Design an enzyme around this catalytic site. Structure first.
Site, mmCIF file in Angstrom:
data_model
loop_
_atom_site.group_PDB
_atom_site.id
_atom_site.type_symbol
_atom_site.label_atom_id
_atom_site.label_comp_id
_atom_site.label_asym_id
_atom_site.label_seq_id
_atom_site.Cartn_x
_atom_site.Cartn_y
_atom_site.Cartn_z
ATOM 1 N N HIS A 26 37.334 46.125 30.769
ATOM 2 C CA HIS A 26 37.317 44.693 31.105
ATOM 3 C C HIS A 26 35.910 44.156 31.434
ATOM 4 O O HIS A 26 35.706 42.950 31.350
ATOM 5 C CB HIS A 26 38.351 44.345 32.192
ATOM 6 C CG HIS A 26 37.901 44.539 33.601
ATOM 7 N ND1 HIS A 26 38.270 45.655 34.321
ATOM 8 C CD2 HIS A 26 37.206 43.706 34.409
ATOM 9 C CE1 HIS A 26 37.767 45.492 35.532
ATOM 10 N NE2 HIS A 26 37.113 44.332 35.633
ATOM 11 N N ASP A 69 42.267 50.423 31.009
ATOM 12 C CA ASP A 69 40.995 49.849 31.435
ATOM 13 C C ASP A 69 39.878 50.884 31.565
ATOM 14 O O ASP A 69 39.465 51.259 32.675
ATOM 15 C CB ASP A 69 41.173 49.036 32.725
ATOM 16 C CG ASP A 69 39.979 48.153 33.026
ATOM 17 O OD1 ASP A 69 39.204 47.850 32.078
ATOM 18 O OD2 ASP A 69 39.840 47.722 34.202
ATOM 19 N N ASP A 126 38.845 47.971 50.801
ATOM 20 C CA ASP A 126 39.194 47.970 49.373
ATOM 21 C C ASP A 126 37.934 47.921 48.528
ATOM 22 O O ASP A 126 36.861 47.612 49.044
ATOM 23 C CB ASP A 126 40.047 46.700 49.074
ATOM 24 C CG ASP A 126 40.825 46.665 47.769
ATOM 25 O OD1 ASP A 126 40.791 47.680 47.021
ATOM 26 O OD2 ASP A 126 41.421 45.603 47.460
ATOM 27 N N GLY A 162 33.372 42.981 41.826
ATOM 28 C CA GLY A 162 32.005 43.369 41.477
ATOM 29 C C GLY A 162 31.796 44.878 41.462
ATOM 30 O O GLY A 162 30.741 45.357 41.037
ATOM 31 N N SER A 173 34.075 46.788 39.876
ATOM 32 C CA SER A 173 34.756 47.107 38.602
ATOM 33 C C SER A 173 33.941 48.109 37.789
ATOM 34 O O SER A 173 32.721 47.953 37.689
ATOM 35 C CB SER A 173 34.952 45.841 37.758
ATOM 36 O OG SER A 173 35.949 44.997 38.319
ATOM 37 N N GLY A 174 34.611 49.132 37.251
ATOM 38 C CA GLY A 174 33.958 50.159 36.439
ATOM 39 C C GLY A 174 33.378 51.329 37.217
ATOM 40 O O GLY A 174 33.068 52.376 36.635
HETATM 41 C C1 LIG Z 1 41.769 45.016 33.709
HETATM 42 C C2 LIG Z 1 41.144 44.201 34.728
HETATM 43 O O1 LIG Z 1 42.144 43.338 35.279
HETATM 44 C C3 LIG Z 1 41.779 42.483 36.296
HETATM 45 C C4 LIG Z 1 42.831 41.710 36.769
HETATM 46 C C5 LIG Z 1 42.652 40.952 37.918
HETATM 47 O O2 LIG Z 1 43.653 40.271 38.578
HETATM 48 C C6 LIG Z 1 45.062 40.538 38.292
HETATM 49 C C7 LIG Z 1 45.873 40.356 39.538
HETATM 50 C C8 LIG Z 1 45.434 39.563 37.223
HETATM 51 C C9 LIG Z 1 41.403 40.925 38.513
HETATM 52 F F1 LIG Z 1 41.200 40.105 39.562
HETATM 53 C C10 LIG Z 1 40.327 41.665 38.043
HETATM 54 C C11 LIG Z 1 38.995 41.675 38.791
HETATM 55 N N1 LIG Z 1 38.665 43.033 39.212
HETATM 56 C C12 LIG Z 1 39.090 43.611 40.409
HETATM 57 C C13 LIG Z 1 38.748 44.925 40.724
HETATM 58 C C14 LIG Z 1 39.219 45.512 41.887
HETATM 59 C C15 LIG Z 1 40.046 44.803 42.759
HETATM 60 C C16 LIG Z 1 40.541 45.427 44.017
HETATM 61 N N2 LIG Z 1 41.127 44.629 44.938
HETATM 62 N N3 LIG Z 1 40.451 46.708 44.123
HETATM 63 C C17 LIG Z 1 40.368 43.488 42.440
HETATM 64 C C18 LIG Z 1 39.894 42.896 41.287
HETATM 65 C C19 LIG Z 1 37.975 41.113 37.847
HETATM 66 N N4 LIG Z 1 36.833 41.690 37.520
HETATM 67 C C20 LIG Z 1 36.239 40.839 36.614
HETATM 68 C C21 LIG Z 1 35.002 41.249 35.933
HETATM 69 C C22 LIG Z 1 34.192 42.238 36.480
HETATM 70 C C23 LIG Z 1 32.989 42.564 35.884
HETATM 71 C C24 LIG Z 1 32.631 41.998 34.682
HETATM 72 C C25 LIG Z 1 33.462 41.074 34.085
HETATM 73 C C26 LIG Z 1 34.635 40.683 34.714
HETATM 74 C C27 LIG Z 1 37.056 39.768 36.392
HETATM 75 N N5 LIG Z 1 38.140 39.938 37.199
HETATM 76 C C28 LIG Z 1 40.538 42.454 36.915
#
Ligand SMILES: CCOc1cc(OC(C)C)c(F)c([C@@H](Nc2ccc(C(=N)N)cc2)c2nc(-c3ccccc3)c[nH]2)c1
Ligand SMILES: [Ca+2]
Lengths: 55, 254
Positions: free
Chosen positions: B41, B90, B186, B190, B192-193
Protein backbone atom coordinates in the site's frame (compact mmCIF):
# COMPACT_ATOMS: atom_id res chain seq x y z
CA UNK A 1 9.54 -33.72 17.02
CA UNK A 2 9.79 -30.22 15.37
CA UNK A 3 6.20 -29.26 16.30
CA UNK A 4 7.17 -29.71 20.04
CA UNK A 5 9.48 -26.92 21.45
CA UNK A 6 11.03 -26.46 17.92
CA UNK A 7 12.53 -30.02 18.26
CA UNK A 8 15.04 -28.47 20.69
CA UNK A 9 16.56 -26.48 17.73
CA UNK A 10 17.83 -22.94 18.25
CA UNK A 11 16.71 -21.99 14.69
CA UNK A 12 15.29 -24.33 11.97
CA UNK A 13 14.00 -27.89 12.44
CA UNK A 14 13.40 -30.68 9.88
CA UNK A 15 11.53 -33.97 10.69
CA UNK A 16 12.91 -37.18 9.14
CA UNK A 17 11.88 -40.90 8.78
CA UNK A 18 11.24 -42.12 12.35
CA UNK A 19 12.23 -40.25 15.55
CA UNK A 20 14.96 -38.54 13.40
CA UNK A 21 15.36 -34.72 13.58
CA UNK A 22 17.85 -32.36 11.90
CA UNK A 23 18.35 -28.78 13.17
CA UNK A 24 19.49 -26.18 10.67
CA UNK A 25 20.57 -22.53 10.68
CA UNK A 26 19.94 -19.37 8.58
CA UNK A 27 22.81 -18.42 6.17
CA UNK A 28 25.68 -16.74 8.04
CA UNK A 29 25.43 -19.37 10.86
CA UNK A 30 26.81 -22.96 11.42
CA UNK A 31 25.32 -25.76 13.54
CA UNK A 32 27.36 -26.80 16.59
CA UNK A 33 28.25 -30.48 17.43
CA UNK A 34 25.34 -30.47 19.97
CA UNK A 35 23.22 -30.51 16.77
CA UNK A 36 20.90 -27.74 18.07
CA UNK A 37 22.96 -24.52 18.48
CA UNK A 38 23.67 -21.98 15.76
CA UNK A 39 26.86 -19.93 15.80
CA UNK A 40 27.60 -16.88 13.52
CA UNK A 41 30.10 -17.46 10.70
CA UNK A 42 30.09 -13.80 9.50
CA UNK A 43 30.79 -10.42 11.07
CA UNK A 44 27.14 -9.23 10.72
CA UNK A 45 24.77 -12.21 11.00
CA UNK A 46 21.06 -11.46 10.56
CA UNK A 47 18.91 -10.75 13.64
CA UNK A 48 21.80 -9.81 15.98
CA UNK A 49 22.45 -6.28 17.27
CA UNK A 50 26.19 -5.45 17.14
CA UNK A 51 26.14 -2.70 19.81
CA UNK A 52 24.36 -5.12 22.21
CA UNK A 53 26.48 -8.19 21.12
CA UNK A 54 29.85 -6.33 21.60
CA UNK A 55 28.65 -4.99 25.01
CA UNK B 1 4.54 4.84 16.91
CA UNK B 2 2.18 5.76 19.81
CA UNK B 3 3.26 5.04 23.41
CA UNK B 4 6.69 3.61 22.66
CA UNK B 5 10.16 5.03 23.17
CA UNK B 6 13.15 6.14 21.07
CA UNK B 7 14.92 3.06 19.68
CA UNK B 8 18.55 3.66 20.90
CA UNK B 9 20.72 4.39 17.82
CA UNK B 10 21.88 1.05 16.34
CA UNK B 11 19.33 -1.09 18.22
CA UNK B 12 16.87 -1.35 15.18
CA UNK B 13 19.66 -1.82 12.51
CA UNK B 14 17.35 -3.53 10.00
CA UNK B 15 14.96 -0.52 9.98
CA UNK B 16 14.59 1.04 6.55
CA UNK B 17 13.28 4.55 5.79
CA UNK B 18 11.60 4.90 2.35
CA UNK B 19 11.64 8.35 0.72
CA UNK B 20 9.90 9.72 -2.41
CA UNK B 21 11.33 13.11 -3.64
CA UNK B 22 13.08 13.32 -0.23
CA UNK B 23 9.78 13.14 1.71
CA UNK B 24 9.10 10.38 4.25
CA UNK B 25 6.98 7.67 2.64
CA UNK B 26 7.13 4.40 4.66
CA UNK B 27 9.20 2.03 6.72
CA UNK B 28 10.81 -1.19 5.57
CA UNK B 29 12.93 -4.11 6.77
CA UNK B 30 16.34 -5.07 5.40
CA UNK B 31 16.53 -8.92 5.11
CA UNK B 32 19.99 -9.17 3.40
CA UNK B 33 22.30 -6.64 1.65
CA UNK B 34 20.08 -6.01 -1.44
CA UNK B 35 16.48 -6.85 -0.34
CA UNK B 36 13.93 -4.86 1.66
CA UNK B 37 10.48 -5.98 2.76
CA UNK B 38 7.81 -3.26 2.97
CA UNK B 39 3.98 -2.88 2.51
CA UNK B 40 2.39 -2.88 -0.98
CA UNK B 41 0.00 0.00 0.00
CA UNK B 42 3.13 2.31 0.38
CA UNK B 43 3.22 2.40 -3.44
CA UNK B 44 -0.49 2.94 -4.49
CA UNK B 45 0.04 6.68 -5.25
CA UNK B 46 3.61 6.60 -6.64
CA UNK B 47 4.11 8.19 -10.12
CA UNK B 48 7.88 9.04 -9.92
CA UNK B 49 9.23 5.42 -9.46
CA UNK B 50 12.80 6.71 -10.18
CA UNK B 51 12.64 9.10 -7.14
CA UNK B 52 12.22 6.24 -4.59
CA UNK B 53 15.07 5.94 -2.04
CA UNK B 54 15.78 3.46 0.78
CA UNK B 55 17.84 4.77 3.72
CA UNK B 56 19.64 2.28 6.08
CA UNK B 57 21.40 3.19 9.33
CA UNK B 58 18.97 6.09 9.83
CA UNK B 59 18.12 7.21 13.37
CA UNK B 60 17.58 10.99 13.59
CA UNK B 61 15.95 12.80 10.64
CA UNK B 62 17.30 16.23 11.66
CA UNK B 63 21.01 15.39 11.32
CA UNK B 64 23.42 13.46 9.06
CA UNK B 65 25.87 11.51 11.30
CA UNK B 66 27.64 9.46 8.59
CA UNK B 67 26.03 6.05 9.42
CA UNK B 68 23.16 6.59 6.91
CA UNK B 69 23.34 4.69 3.61
CA UNK B 70 21.02 5.71 0.72
CA UNK B 71 20.19 3.43 -2.19
CA UNK B 72 17.91 3.80 -5.18
CA UNK B 73 15.11 1.20 -5.30
CA UNK B 74 15.60 -0.74 -8.57
CA UNK B 75 12.47 -2.90 -8.24
CA UNK B 76 9.20 -2.98 -6.28
CA UNK B 77 7.58 -6.46 -6.37
CA UNK B 78 3.94 -6.80 -5.33
CA UNK B 79 1.87 -10.04 -5.24
CA UNK B 80 -0.75 -10.36 -8.04
CA UNK B 81 -3.44 -10.84 -5.36
CA UNK B 82 -2.89 -7.39 -3.83
CA UNK B 83 -5.53 -4.87 -5.03
CA UNK B 84 -4.64 -1.12 -4.61
CA UNK B 85 -6.87 0.62 -2.03
CA UNK B 86 -7.75 -2.69 -0.25
CA UNK B 87 -6.11 -4.41 2.80
CA UNK B 88 -5.30 -8.02 1.80
CA UNK B 89 -1.79 -9.22 0.73
CA UNK B 90 -0.09 -6.02 1.99
CA UNK B 91 3.54 -6.81 1.18
CA UNK B 92 6.18 -5.50 -1.21
CA UNK B 93 9.65 -6.84 -1.91
CA UNK B 94 12.21 -4.19 -2.91
CA UNK B 95 15.49 -4.75 -4.70
CA UNK B 96 18.14 -2.07 -4.01
CA UNK B 97 20.13 -0.80 -7.03
CA UNK B 98 23.40 -1.50 -5.15
CA UNK B 99 23.86 -3.52 -1.92
CA UNK B 100 24.11 -1.71 1.41
CA UNK B 101 27.37 -2.26 3.36
CA UNK B 102 26.76 -4.17 6.63
CA UNK B 103 28.12 -2.24 9.66
CA UNK B 104 27.22 -1.94 13.38
CA UNK B 105 24.34 0.34 12.27
CA UNK B 106 23.11 -1.60 9.21
CA UNK B 107 22.22 -5.27 9.79
CA UNK B 108 19.52 -7.45 8.14
CA UNK B 109 16.67 -9.01 10.13
CA UNK B 110 16.36 -12.80 9.58
CA UNK B 111 13.58 -13.78 7.19
CA UNK B 112 12.54 -17.06 8.94
CA UNK B 113 11.52 -20.37 7.31
CA UNK B 114 7.72 -20.77 7.09
CA UNK B 115 7.49 -23.85 9.41
CA UNK B 116 9.65 -22.27 12.10
CA UNK B 117 7.58 -19.01 11.80
CA UNK B 118 4.18 -20.78 11.96
CA UNK B 119 4.98 -23.36 14.67
CA UNK B 120 7.33 -21.35 16.88
CA UNK B 121 7.51 -17.59 16.18
CA UNK B 122 3.71 -17.23 15.94
CA UNK B 123 3.55 -18.25 19.68
CA UNK B 124 6.13 -15.71 20.95
CA UNK B 125 3.71 -13.25 22.66
CA UNK B 126 5.60 -9.93 22.33
CA UNK B 127 7.39 -8.43 19.33
CA UNK B 128 8.79 -5.01 18.44
CA UNK B 129 7.24 -2.59 15.91
CA UNK B 130 9.15 0.48 14.82
CA UNK B 131 9.16 3.63 12.65
CA UNK B 132 9.21 7.42 12.26
CA UNK B 133 5.38 7.56 12.15
CA UNK B 134 2.90 9.64 14.16
CA UNK B 135 3.58 9.99 17.89
CA UNK B 136 -0.19 10.48 18.37
CA UNK B 137 -3.25 9.92 16.24
CA UNK B 138 -3.69 13.22 14.20
CA UNK B 139 -0.29 14.28 15.63
CA UNK B 140 3.22 15.00 14.30
CA UNK B 141 5.63 12.23 13.09
CA UNK B 142 8.84 11.36 15.06
CA UNK B 143 12.31 12.85 14.29
CA UNK B 144 14.04 9.90 16.05
CA UNK B 145 13.24 6.24 15.36
CA UNK B 146 10.64 4.87 17.78
CA UNK B 147 10.02 1.31 18.98
CA UNK B 148 7.10 -0.37 20.75
CA UNK B 149 6.68 -3.86 22.29
CA UNK B 150 3.24 -5.30 21.32
CA UNK B 151 1.54 -8.64 22.17
CA UNK B 152 0.16 -10.77 19.31
CA UNK B 153 -3.42 -12.06 19.44
CA UNK B 154 -5.18 -14.98 17.79
CA UNK B 155 -7.62 -13.57 15.16
CA UNK B 156 -10.70 -15.06 16.99
CA UNK B 157 -9.55 -13.15 20.15
CA UNK B 158 -8.88 -9.97 18.11
CA UNK B 159 -12.43 -9.96 16.62
CA UNK B 160 -14.11 -10.68 20.03
CA UNK B 161 -11.96 -7.99 21.83
CA UNK B 162 -12.67 -5.36 19.11
CA UNK B 163 -15.38 -2.67 18.98
CA UNK B 164 -17.71 -3.67 16.08
CA UNK B 165 -17.17 -0.79 13.57
CA UNK B 166 -19.25 -0.66 10.34
CA UNK B 167 -17.71 -1.35 6.85
CA UNK B 168 -14.48 -2.56 8.70
CA UNK B 169 -12.15 -4.72 6.53
CA UNK B 170 -11.95 -8.45 7.31
CA UNK B 171 -8.89 -9.82 9.13
CA UNK B 172 -7.74 -12.56 6.69
CA UNK B 173 -5.22 -15.45 7.10
CA UNK B 174 -2.63 -13.05 5.48
CA UNK B 175 -2.91 -10.75 8.55
CA UNK B 176 -2.67 -10.78 12.35
CA UNK B 177 -3.57 -8.42 15.19
CA UNK B 178 -1.06 -7.08 17.66
CA UNK B 179 -1.20 -4.35 20.25
CA UNK B 180 -3.58 -2.96 22.91
CA UNK B 181 -7.30 -2.04 22.92
CA UNK B 182 -6.97 0.64 25.69
CA UNK B 183 -5.87 3.40 23.23
CA UNK B 184 -2.36 3.85 24.68
CA UNK B 185 0.06 1.95 22.36
CA UNK B 186 0.08 1.20 18.62
CA UNK B 187 1.97 1.63 15.33
CA UNK B 188 0.53 4.36 13.02
CA UNK B 189 0.00 5.08 9.29
CA UNK B 190 3.47 6.72 8.96
CA UNK B 191 5.00 3.47 10.32
CA UNK B 192 3.38 1.49 7.41
CA UNK B 193 5.80 -1.06 5.90
CA UNK B 194 7.98 -1.17 9.02
CA UNK B 195 9.04 -4.38 10.85
CA UNK B 196 7.16 -6.41 13.43
CA UNK B 197 10.29 -8.26 14.74
CA UNK B 198 10.22 -11.36 17.05
CA UNK B 199 12.99 -12.53 19.38
CA UNK B 200 13.68 -16.26 19.68
CA UNK B 201 16.68 -17.81 21.45
CA UNK B 202 19.01 -14.79 20.98
CA UNK B 203 17.99 -13.95 17.36
CA UNK B 204 15.41 -11.57 15.84
CA UNK B 205 13.13 -12.53 12.90
CA UNK B 206 10.67 -10.81 10.56
CA UNK B 207 7.06 -11.87 11.45
CA UNK B 208 4.94 -8.90 10.43
CA UNK B 209 4.70 -5.68 8.45
CA UNK B 210 2.88 -2.50 9.76
CA UNK B 211 -0.22 -2.62 7.51
CA UNK B 212 -3.46 -1.13 8.83
CA UNK B 213 -5.85 -0.32 11.68
CA UNK B 214 -8.78 1.97 12.67
CA UNK B 215 -7.02 5.28 13.36
CA UNK B 216 -3.90 5.04 15.62
CA UNK B 217 -4.16 3.66 19.21
CA UNK B 218 -8.04 3.85 19.01
CA UNK B 219 -9.87 2.40 22.08
CA UNK B 220 -11.44 -0.95 21.14
CA UNK B 221 -8.90 -1.51 18.31
CA UNK B 222 -5.57 -3.26 17.62
CA UNK B 223 -2.89 -2.83 14.96
CA UNK B 224 -3.18 -5.17 11.94
CA UNK B 225 0.05 -6.59 10.44
CA UNK B 226 0.80 -8.58 7.27
CA UNK B 227 1.47 -12.22 8.26
CA UNK B 228 4.92 -12.61 6.68
CA UNK B 229 4.98 -16.47 7.22
CA UNK B 230 2.45 -16.75 4.30
CA UNK B 231 4.97 -15.11 1.90
CA UNK B 232 8.28 -16.89 2.71
CA UNK B 233 8.32 -19.14 -0.42
CA UNK B 234 7.01 -16.24 -2.60
CA UNK B 235 9.85 -13.98 -1.24
CA UNK B 236 12.55 -16.71 -1.55
CA UNK B 237 11.68 -17.51 -5.17
CA UNK B 238 11.79 -13.79 -6.13
CA UNK B 239 15.17 -13.20 -4.39
CA UNK B 240 16.68 -15.99 -6.59
CA UNK B 241 15.29 -14.40 -9.81
CA UNK B 242 17.02 -12.12 -12.28
CA UNK B 243 16.04 -8.40 -12.23
CA UNK B 244 13.50 -7.36 -14.96
CA UNK B 245 13.35 -3.93 -16.73
CA UNK B 246 10.96 -1.41 -15.07
CA UNK B 247 10.62 -0.61 -11.34
CA UNK B 248 7.16 -2.08 -10.61
CA UNK B 249 6.67 -5.84 -10.98
CA UNK B 250 3.49 -7.77 -10.18
CA UNK B 251 4.39 -11.39 -9.41
CA UNK B 252 1.98 -14.31 -9.16
CA UNK B 253 0.88 -15.26 -5.67
CA UNK B 254 1.08 -18.10 -4.53
C1 LIG C 1 -3.51 -2.03 3.21
C2 LIG C 1 -3.47 -0.77 3.92
O1 LIG C 1 -4.79 -0.49 4.40
C3 LIG C 1 -4.99 0.65 5.14
C4 LIG C 1 -6.30 0.81 5.57
C5 LIG C 1 -6.61 1.81 6.48
O2 LIG C 1 -7.82 1.97 7.10
C6 LIG C 1 -8.83 0.90 7.08
C7 LIG C 1 -9.61 0.93 8.36
C8 LIG C 1 -9.67 1.18 5.89
C9 LIG C 1 -5.60 2.68 6.87
F1 LIG C 1 -5.92 3.71 7.67
C10 LIG C 1 -4.29 2.56 6.43
C11 LIG C 1 -3.20 3.49 6.97
N1 LIG C 1 -2.16 2.71 7.63
C12 LIG C 1 -2.20 2.33 8.98
C13 LIG C 1 -1.17 1.57 9.53
C14 LIG C 1 -1.24 1.15 10.85
C15 LIG C 1 -2.33 1.48 11.65
C16 LIG C 1 -2.40 1.05 13.07
N2 LIG C 1 -3.35 1.60 13.86
N3 LIG C 1 -1.60 0.11 13.45
C17 LIG C 1 -3.34 2.26 11.09
C18 LIG C 1 -3.28 2.68 9.78
C19 LIG C 1 -2.67 4.25 5.79
N4 LIG C 1 -1.40 4.33 5.45
C20 LIG C 1 -1.38 5.10 4.30
C21 LIG C 1 -0.13 5.28 3.56
C22 LIG C 1 1.10 5.09 4.20
C23 LIG C 1 2.28 5.34 3.52
C24 LIG C 1 2.27 5.66 2.19
C25 LIG C 1 1.06 5.78 1.52
C26 LIG C 1 -0.13 5.60 2.21
C27 LIG C 1 -2.66 5.43 3.96
N5 LIG C 1 -3.47 4.91 4.93
C28 LIG C 1 -4.00 1.52 5.55
CA1 LIG D 1 20.28 11.04 10.38
Amino acid sequence: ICVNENGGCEQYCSDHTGTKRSCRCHEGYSLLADGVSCTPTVEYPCGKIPILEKR
Amino acid sequence: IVGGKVCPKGECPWQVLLLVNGAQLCGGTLINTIWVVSAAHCFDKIKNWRNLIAVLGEHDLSEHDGDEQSRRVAQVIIPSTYVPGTTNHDIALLRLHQPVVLTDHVVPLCLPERTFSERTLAFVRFSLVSGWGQLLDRGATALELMVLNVPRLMTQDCLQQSRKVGDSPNITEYMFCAGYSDGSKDSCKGDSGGPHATHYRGTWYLTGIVSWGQGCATVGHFGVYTRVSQYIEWLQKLMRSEPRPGVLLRAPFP
